[PDB]
RNA sequence: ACGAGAACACGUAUGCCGAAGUAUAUAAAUC
């Protein structure tokens, strides 16, 4: 049940719909994509990690502090402006022990980077030929302070996690974002076991908080939504090397729960096929990683 | 499967002007206010020069991936940053990091002149850089490195940035180290100058 | 003339003798306001409905105490609705103008009630509602009259639907405590995401207009389906619609049916980026009145069930049908980026192309018409098309939507930080009624939609200046 | 695709005042010594060589020039783009000269004092002008691109004409009143990139 | 287009005291010898040739002067475009004088002691003036631009008038007490740039 | 606008001590022969011709002079600009005098021994002084500018009077005891620049 | 400002030896014929005139004399300016004496031979109209005293007494009447 | 099998044109 720490040193581009967009964090599906591509690139076996690994979302950290997504459990004006809650207060959050002034101070302290729209041009056009207009475009980047970054949670047996160690060691030289081949998004990592992370991960309760993006299988959906509080977010995009035309290849739309979901009845997930008229399957990750409180 | 890292430094011989903000405003970081050279700049200038020299080589090394055939990039160029040696030396000698140049323009038929300002990174500074190469085909590394050497030569005898026909941008490359960072491929014999 | 119309007509104008008494016209300013209004309206030939005269003559206590009316006659229900709602030459000029308009312009037949409503609005939107020395009157006469109508129609739906005919004995406190009527709320999500789905700066007003127009269309439709009028709509805008209906089984069934149809249509037109949620909490005659501060409680409960409905906005069948495969590979909308809809040659889907064309027309033309076939999509296989002024009157001769233009008499037309404390509390004591939130919503809407345009008529530094000006004006506001 | 390099020495004959500050002279701020900006040289050559060939009133208005001049310096604005071929870099104070001046203790900068006599009143007003010392040297570098094989000889003939004209003219200001005369010496031509021989070429 | 060269020697008749640094003289600092700046020559010739033609009080007010004067010395200041047509260079202490003065042990500078007598007081005040020595020589070069093919003769006539007038006047400072009288010798005319004739041209 | 020349010889009859090197005599450093500085002549003439006209004590305190003196000589000190109209150059040994003293083996300087005898003690104190040999001839030139066509006659009458008073006086120092008496000879007038009629003017 | 002139001749009877050499006699090296320094006559007339009037020992220490000597002869070293009003010029021979000596073949040096004539020319400036008479009568007295005293060095054994003759008082510059004056 | 992937904030223009380190002043006064 190890955790992984990542520091970047260079701005990163994650984005939501367009290149003008800048986003702080990415999803378990993007990282499953990265790991799968790197395994196929290294020439190893994907069988072991297709159906033995459970991954969580990316999360921010600061100097000696950790954050987790807001669970969907009087002021009703300050909490709505909050996205992440510190670990030390996580239990205190679920018992109603957090006050408005404390929350406001939290909002004050939570600056972990900034945003920037870098403008560029393209002269590969008939500018090579003759008079032709230039094409200014814009990329969006996020930049970290020297002591902030990302962390992940992974669990299973020792063998699978040794494989994961090797994969991260290889991966730390490629990137985790958009314009990777343009100079964005490299990192260095460390393997950590914090005590309080293990304490939260090993609770005992009646509800469950989701730390990933997952979808229920057919035969269980009717029993999954008995008493639930969730968010559906459409996830679409383009593929990397399915067929001839990139434009003619675009993933079929998918809907999945978000990362603050609370479920009274657990479900196992599945790795879902979102391919059609392609040569090889295109997988979306959907398998939940719970914390039971 | 192996990954190779080429590291070194670039020195500014005559004043440099990238100026993404403008055109005086030179690109920096918005917090530390230190000049940098974006990797898109280097990638584009090298692409233009090497294409002018000559195709499948530019396509295998920089990647096209929409022309009806899909080729994935094989060389990754990162941003460049001010080095510690230069910061220490400049802080001791009490030198600013950036210059401001005043220029003028003359009207034909009217002989009236009007001014300009161009902000420009100082002479003698240094930047640190790293490139990554992903060895996807064993029988091609010598060819790819010949081509990358030619590109660095051409960029050495040319300019980076804007206003180079009037005297800006000239750079040099020093202190190269070529280490194999993932895998077991022998890259203790390569050279890039 | 259906009796519903009789109550409604005797309801809007039941409090006009007050103006004819404030105007100082010596002809009809000597007696009590009810008989002054009756004497005024006893002139015009169109308004000669007898039961309407009966309704308007006795909207108070003693008048009914000495009138020994029949058991079925709307003066009693007028009294009850009036009570629940309650909780200098310019007037003379106004009543001259009123006489002219009443004898010349308006019609009295069925379906003229919306026109009468706009007429009363355009005339009375500033008349002081009352000059009571012991009360703070932050309301206009328009709000008193209109909310009296809404309450009257709801009380009648309740009383009639349960098969009571002895209105007098039933309504002449004990009834005031019964769970009589019902508060209903529509909230549409995803406005921020849909408003910023453009690729430049002035183009993000056309789709703002589209959202606003859809909200108004759906609410007007809802009122039509329930045999009341646009009287019963308290507030609209943002993404909200606060409405008032009756507490009976029939309206509940119809609300459920309408909800199913809307959910189906919103899913059909748009996958999930735009939803609609409806929640209803029952209220008594006491709840809207200020008795034990329960109005805050009612509002909080409606918001709570709204949040819950937002949390579980789909079912298993819907989510399985959503994850069913469909054709792709074709290009997506160049501005809207969605690949489930057939596209035209220009590269824009139906709705986005319609919006750009309607904005181009709106820059010149300024009337919108709701037809069976036309240009831009609406609920229940309806369309909106663009037309000009004279075209509008010719179409009226043979529903119309405008932009802040108080044109009256042309058929049926509909003229289109600390917010939580204002919307939920208003005035906590001695003024905590539905009327106060009505007037507060009207004043805020006038500030937001009309005063903002006047301020921007003369318009990085500008953004900061506007922010400072808005902050100062809001500080002056409260 | 080939690139040809030209290097040599600029020698100051009479005092020189590039004076781009506004009365100071332009300085590098890592060494605090004078420099000769390259845009000065390009602009002066543009003007001189343009006036050599026909310069028309209509050609005076639009800042367009003869086809040859546009070819060698670039137009790239007329709706018919023209990429330049001759890149002019700056020139810096030489190390030989700084050694010599430090040894013989010669200050690098003169401050000439000047006066003006107005008419009707004959009251004089004075002023100060800084200027580089004579005997100084600077090191200059040019790069020329072979975009076409058959135009090289003509292009270098035209550059030779520009050199002659500039050597009988002035750089900087106050040229009619004395300042700013230069010479070029110790040149060298080399094909730094490509496979185009440059042995028969010369710039005097 | 053509540029024509004039060259010659200036001969010092009585003491010369430019004093550009001021009671010292103006000196180079690569060699530490006197020079004659071009500014003073230009200004003095201009003042003579303007006074000889008309000088109006309103024209005295703002340095507005005759048309030929502005054609040959340049104004381009009143919205009319006119850059100078004569380029005047500095005068450097000549070599033959150096050889002669070295091998006869004669210095390059006299130091004259001067006295002032006060009115009604008869007290003397002493002063020291540092004059360039008699018998010296200097070398000068002028460049003429040919901007118009039908004015060369007229402009040269005006130039010889200015030279003659200056041979009957003084260059420098304090010439009303015996300083600055000069002469011109060994004048040669060459066309440096173009295909123009200079066999009929002369300046005395 | 024109310029007249006045030339001639100054003949010294008695001792001439000028001592500008001061007890030696001021001397050219290129020929090693005496001169009369033009400053001396201008000052002596100014003082004589200025004492003749009105010389007020209040004017003496403020160093103001008579209008004739300033127009002929120029002060430009009281805020009113007056440029000198008479230019005086130095003097030098004439060729005939050099030939005569060379043929006759006669030197150019006399050493006079003077004895001071003091009151109440009678101690003889000796002194040596250098003088210019009597009978030598100097060549002088004045330049006269015309700024007004009229006042030439009055100006020349005044310069006549000035020459007269100087000829009845001494030049240099040591005058009230036997040195300085000179006269003028061989005066000539020749118009050297311009188109003026000055053939009836007469300097005696 | 008028320049009056005095001129005259001086006759030599006792073989004169001035002592301008500091045993030779001072000569202008143009003619190799004897001269007389003007400081000689100036100082000797000065001393005689000073002796005639009162001479104080304290003034002897400080080289101060009577106002008449400080005006006519003039010193201008005490901080009060006194520019001299009597320019004495050096005296030469007369051509009459030269012709007579050449005809009779007589040398000039033995000492200054007897029978010489000397042409002395004084220039007197009129800085004040009134004091002219007083100044000229004083000059007449000084001339008489000189005529009855000795000029030269070491003349106390019989040498250095000489005579005055043949004057001419002509105004050379000015418009002042100078007919009533006399210097015998 | 990462809202992906190809994409030099480029291009034409300088330090300008005009301007006297000048104007007055005896190396002089006593033996």
mmCIF file with all atom_site columns, C-alpha atoms in Angstrom, chain D residues 93-194:
data_model
loop_
_atom_site.group_PDB
_atom_site.id
_atom_site.type_symbol
_atom_site.label_atom_id
_atom_site.label_alt_id
_atom_site.label_comp_id
_atom_site.label_asym_id
_atom_site.label_entity_id
_atom_site.label_seq_id
_atom_site.pdbx_PDB_ins_code
_atom_site.Cartn_x
_atom_site.Cartn_y
_atom_site.Cartn_z
_atom_site.occupancy
_atom_site.B_iso_or_equiv
_atom_site.pdbx_formal_charge
_atom_site.auth_seq_id
_atom_site.auth_comp_id
_atom_site.auth_asym_id
_atom_site.auth_atom_id
_atom_site.pdbx_PDB_model_num
ATOM 1   C CA . UNK D 1 93  ? 36.586 45.919 -27.956 1.00 0.00 ? 93  UNK D CA 1
ATOM 2   C CA . UNK D 1 94  ? 39.627 43.808 -28.740 1.00 0.00 ? 94  UNK D CA 1
ATOM 3   C CA . UNK D 1 95  ? 41.904 42.229 -26.142 1.00 0.00 ? 95  UNK D CA 1
ATOM 4   C CA . UNK D 1 96  ? 45.103 43.371 -27.856 1.00 0.00 ? 96  UNK D CA 1
ATOM 5   C CA . UNK D 1 97  ? 43.988 46.975 -27.503 1.00 0.00 ? 97  UNK D CA 1
ATOM 6   C CA . UNK D 1 98  ? 42.925 46.661 -23.867 1.00 0.00 ? 98  UNK D CA 1
ATOM 7   C CA . UNK D 1 99  ? 46.323 45.149 -23.085 1.00 0.00 ? 99  UNK D CA 1
ATOM 8   C CA . UNK D 1 100 ? 48.090 48.017 -24.849 1.00 0.00 ? 100 UNK D CA 1
ATOM 9   C CA . UNK D 1 101 ? 46.014 50.700 -23.153 1.00 0.00 ? 101 UNK D CA 1
ATOM 10  C CA . UNK D 1 102 ? 46.421 49.223 -19.676 1.00 0.00 ? 102 UNK D CA 1
ATOM 11  C CA . UNK D 1 103 ? 50.179 48.953 -20.219 1.00 0.00 ? 103 UNK D CA 1
ATOM 12  C CA . UNK D 1 104 ? 50.667 52.534 -21.442 1.00 0.00 ? 104 UNK D CA 1
ATOM 13  C CA . UNK D 1 105 ? 47.902 53.895 -19.140 1.00 0.00 ? 105 UNK D CA 1
ATOM 14  C CA . UNK D 1 106 ? 45.614 55.384 -21.781 1.00 0.00 ? 106 UNK D CA 1
ATOM 15  C CA . UNK D 1 107 ? 42.043 56.171 -20.808 1.00 0.00 ? 107 UNK D CA 1
ATOM 16  C CA . UNK D 1 108 ? 39.434 54.672 -23.116 1.00 0.00 ? 108 UNK D CA 1
ATOM 17  C CA . UNK D 1 109 ? 37.248 57.759 -23.495 1.00 0.00 ? 109 UNK D CA 1
ATOM 18  C CA . UNK D 1 110 ? 37.707 61.424 -24.381 1.00 0.00 ? 110 UNK D CA 1
ATOM 19  C CA . UNK D 1 111 ? 35.419 64.267 -23.303 1.00 0.00 ? 111 UNK D CA 1
ATOM 20  C CA . UNK D 1 112 ? 35.632 67.006 -25.926 1.00 0.00 ? 112 UNK D CA 1
ATOM 21  C CA . UNK D 1 113 ? 34.313 70.405 -24.842 1.00 0.00 ? 113 UNK D CA 1
ATOM 22  C CA . UNK D 1 114 ? 32.442 72.398 -27.468 1.00 0.00 ? 114 UNK D CA 1
ATOM 23  C CA . UNK D 1 115 ? 30.868 75.821 -27.867 1.00 0.00 ? 115 UNK D CA 1
ATOM 24  C CA . UNK D 1 116 ? 28.238 77.605 -29.929 1.00 0.00 ? 116 UNK D CA 1
ATOM 25  C CA . UNK D 1 117 ? 28.108 81.298 -30.887 1.00 0.00 ? 117 UNK D CA 1
ATOM 26  C CA . UNK D 1 118 ? 24.624 82.561 -31.715 1.00 0.00 ? 118 UNK D CA 1
ATOM 27  C CA . UNK D 1 119 ? 23.905 85.490 -34.002 1.00 0.00 ? 119 UNK D CA 1
ATOM 28  C CA . UNK D 1 120 ? 22.741 89.014 -32.915 1.00 0.00 ? 120 UNK D CA 1
ATOM 29  C CA . UNK D 1 121 ? 24.043 88.384 -29.365 1.00 0.00 ? 121 UNK D CA 1
ATOM 30  C CA . UNK D 1 122 ? 27.374 86.479 -29.617 1.00 0.00 ? 122 UNK D CA 1
ATOM 31  C CA . UNK D 1 123 ? 26.764 84.886 -26.194 1.00 0.00 ? 123 UNK D CA 1
ATOM 32  C CA . UNK D 1 124 ? 28.312 81.415 -26.214 1.00 0.00 ? 124 UNK D CA 1
ATOM 33  C CA . UNK D 1 125 ? 26.918 78.241 -24.709 1.00 0.00 ? 125 UNK D CA 1
ATOM 34  C CA . UNK D 1 126 ? 29.120 75.189 -24.046 1.00 0.00 ? 126 UNK D CA 1
ATOM 35  C CA . UNK D 1 127 ? 28.608 71.423 -23.994 1.00 0.00 ? 127 UNK D CA 1
ATOM 36  C CA . UNK D 1 128 ? 30.392 68.105 -23.480 1.00 0.00 ? 128 UNK D CA 1
ATOM 37  C CA . UNK D 1 129 ? 30.651 65.130 -25.854 1.00 0.00 ? 129 UNK D CA 1
ATOM 38  C CA . UNK D 1 130 ? 32.165 61.742 -25.007 1.00 0.00 ? 130 UNK D CA 1
ATOM 39  C CA . UNK D 1 131 ? 33.990 59.850 -27.707 1.00 0.00 ? 131 UNK D CA 1
ATOM 40  C CA . UNK D 1 132 ? 36.109 56.745 -28.258 1.00 0.00 ? 132 UNK D CA 1
ATOM 41  C CA . UNK D 1 133 ? 39.865 57.208 -28.550 1.00 0.00 ? 133 UNK D CA 1
ATOM 42  C CA . UNK D 1 134 ? 41.680 56.804 -31.828 1.00 0.00 ? 134 UNK D CA 1
ATOM 43  C CA . UNK D 1 135 ? 43.842 53.749 -32.307 1.00 0.00 ? 135 UNK D CA 1
ATOM 44  C CA . UNK D 1 136 ? 41.152 51.565 -30.778 1.00 0.00 ? 136 UNK D CA 1
ATOM 45  C CA . UNK D 1 137 ? 40.131 48.374 -32.534 1.00 0.00 ? 137 UNK D CA 1
ATOM 46  C CA . UNK D 1 138 ? 36.998 46.271 -32.770 1.00 0.00 ? 138 UNK D CA 1
ATOM 47  C CA . UNK D 1 139 ? 36.419 42.751 -34.081 1.00 0.00 ? 139 UNK D CA 1
ATOM 48  C CA . UNK D 1 140 ? 33.626 42.241 -36.617 1.00 0.00 ? 140 UNK D CA 1
ATOM 49  C CA . UNK D 1 141 ? 31.921 39.154 -38.060 1.00 0.00 ? 141 UNK D CA 1
ATOM 50  C CA . UNK D 1 142 ? 29.493 38.763 -40.995 1.00 0.00 ? 142 UNK D CA 1
ATOM 51  C CA . UNK D 1 143 ? 27.603 35.665 -42.166 1.00 0.00 ? 143 UNK D CA 1
ATOM 52  C CA . UNK D 1 144 ? 26.239 35.250 -45.691 1.00 0.00 ? 144 UNK D CA 1
ATOM 53  C CA . UNK D 1 145 ? 23.831 32.541 -46.850 1.00 0.00 ? 145 UNK D CA 1
ATOM 54  C CA . UNK D 1 146 ? 24.029 30.831 -50.242 1.00 0.00 ? 146 UNK D CA 1
ATOM 55  C CA . UNK D 1 147 ? 20.337 30.627 -51.063 1.00 0.00 ? 147 UNK D CA 1
ATOM 56  C CA . UNK D 1 148 ? 21.266 30.503 -54.760 1.00 0.00 ? 148 UNK D CA 1
ATOM 57  C CA . UNK D 1 149 ? 24.527 29.558 -56.438 1.00 0.00 ? 149 UNK D CA 1
ATOM 58  C CA . UNK D 1 150 ? 24.591 32.002 -59.356 1.00 0.00 ? 150 UNK D CA 1
ATOM 59  C CA . UNK D 1 151 ? 24.179 35.252 -57.386 1.00 0.00 ? 151 UNK D CA 1
ATOM 60  C CA . UNK D 1 152 ? 27.213 34.983 -55.088 1.00 0.00 ? 152 UNK D CA 1
ATOM 61  C CA . UNK D 1 153 ? 29.690 36.916 -57.230 1.00 0.00 ? 153 UNK D CA 1
ATOM 62  C CA . UNK D 1 154 ? 27.296 39.810 -57.805 1.00 0.00 ? 154 UNK D CA 1
ATOM 63  C CA . UNK D 1 155 ? 26.330 39.964 -54.130 1.00 0.00 ? 155 UNK D CA 1
ATOM 64  C CA . UNK D 1 156 ? 29.960 40.201 -53.034 1.00 0.00 ? 156 UNK D CA 1
ATOM 65  C CA . UNK D 1 157 ? 30.647 42.867 -55.655 1.00 0.00 ? 157 UNK D CA 1
ATOM 66  C CA . UNK D 1 158 ? 27.834 44.910 -54.139 1.00 0.00 ? 158 UNK D CA 1
ATOM 67  C CA . UNK D 1 159 ? 29.158 44.372 -50.609 1.00 0.00 ? 159 UNK D CA 1
ATOM 68  C CA . UNK D 1 160 ? 32.550 45.622 -51.792 1.00 0.00 ? 160 UNK D CA 1
ATOM 69  C CA . UNK D 1 161 ? 30.886 48.778 -53.098 1.00 0.00 ? 161 UNK D CA 1
ATOM 70  C CA . UNK D 1 162 ? 29.183 49.276 -49.741 1.00 0.00 ? 162 UNK D CA 1
ATOM 71  C CA . UNK D 1 163 ? 32.523 48.865 -47.930 1.00 0.00 ? 163 UNK D CA 1
ATOM 72  C CA . UNK D 1 164 ? 34.202 51.447 -50.175 1.00 0.00 ? 164 UNK D CA 1
ATOM 73  C CA . UNK D 1 165 ? 31.372 53.933 -49.684 1.00 0.00 ? 165 UNK D CA 1
ATOM 74  C CA . UNK D 1 166 ? 31.304 53.472 -45.913 1.00 0.00 ? 166 UNK D CA 1
ATOM 75  C CA . UNK D 1 167 ? 35.068 53.861 -45.653 1.00 0.00 ? 167 UNK D CA 1
ATOM 76  C CA . UNK D 1 168 ? 34.683 57.255 -47.354 1.00 0.00 ? 168 UNK D CA 1
ATOM 77  C CA . UNK D 1 169 ? 31.832 58.265 -44.993 1.00 0.00 ? 169 UNK D CA 1
ATOM 78  C CA . UNK D 1 170 ? 31.109 58.276 -41.261 1.00 0.00 ? 170 UNK D CA 1
ATOM 79  C CA . UNK D 1 171 ? 29.559 56.076 -38.590 1.00 0.00 ? 171 UNK D CA 1
ATOM 80  C CA . UNK D 1 172 ? 27.744 57.628 -35.691 1.00 0.00 ? 172 UNK D CA 1
ATOM 81  C CA . UNK D 1 173 ? 26.886 61.296 -35.402 1.00 0.00 ? 173 UNK D CA 1
ATOM 82  C CA . UNK D 1 174 ? 28.661 64.573 -35.883 1.00 0.00 ? 174 UNK D CA 1
ATOM 83  C CA . UNK D 1 175 ? 30.175 63.238 -39.077 1.00 0.00 ? 175 UNK D CA 1
ATOM 84  C CA . UNK D 1 176 ? 30.184 66.552 -40.911 1.00 0.00 ? 176 UNK D CA 1
ATOM 85  C CA . UNK D 1 177 ? 31.819 68.230 -37.898 1.00 0.00 ? 177 UNK D CA 1
ATOM 86  C CA . UNK D 1 178 ? 34.664 65.714 -37.746 1.00 0.00 ? 178 UNK D CA 1
ATOM 87  C CA . UNK D 1 179 ? 33.705 62.675 -35.703 1.00 0.00 ? 179 UNK D CA 1
ATOM 88  C CA . UNK D 1 180 ? 33.531 59.070 -36.714 1.00 0.00 ? 180 UNK D CA 1
ATOM 89  C CA . UNK D 1 181 ? 35.916 57.790 -39.356 1.00 0.00 ? 181 UNK D CA 1
ATOM 90  C CA . UNK D 1 182 ? 36.863 54.133 -39.699 1.00 0.00 ? 182 UNK D CA 1
ATOM 91  C CA . UNK D 1 183 ? 38.889 51.644 -41.703 1.00 0.00 ? 183 UNK D CA 1
ATOM 92  C CA . UNK D 1 184 ? 38.706 47.883 -42.142 1.00 0.00 ? 184 UNK D CA 1
ATOM 93  C CA . UNK D 1 185 ? 41.758 45.641 -42.113 1.00 0.00 ? 185 UNK D CA 1
ATOM 94  C CA . UNK D 1 186 ? 42.970 42.060 -41.775 1.00 0.00 ? 186 UNK D CA 1
ATOM 95  C CA . UNK D 1 187 ? 39.974 40.383 -43.373 1.00 0.00 ? 187 UNK D CA 1
ATOM 96  C CA . UNK D 1 188 ? 39.356 36.691 -43.981 1.00 0.00 ? 188 UNK D CA 1
ATOM 97  C CA . UNK D 1 189 ? 36.835 34.636 -45.967 1.00 0.00 ? 189 UNK D CA 1
ATOM 98  C CA . UNK D 1 190 ? 35.910 31.039 -45.130 1.00 0.00 ? 190 UNK D CA 1
ATOM 99  C CA . UNK D 1 191 ? 33.099 28.625 -45.970 1.00 0.00 ? 191 UNK D CA 1
ATOM 100 C CA . UNK D 1 192 ? 32.104 27.742 -42.449 1.00 0.00 ? 192 UNK D CA 1
ATOM 101 C CA . UNK D 1 193 ? 29.213 25.431 -43.395 1.00 0.00 ? 193 UNK D CA 1
ATOM 102 C CA . UNK D 1 194 ? 28.502 23.572 -46.610 1.00 0.00 ? 194 UNK D CA 1
#
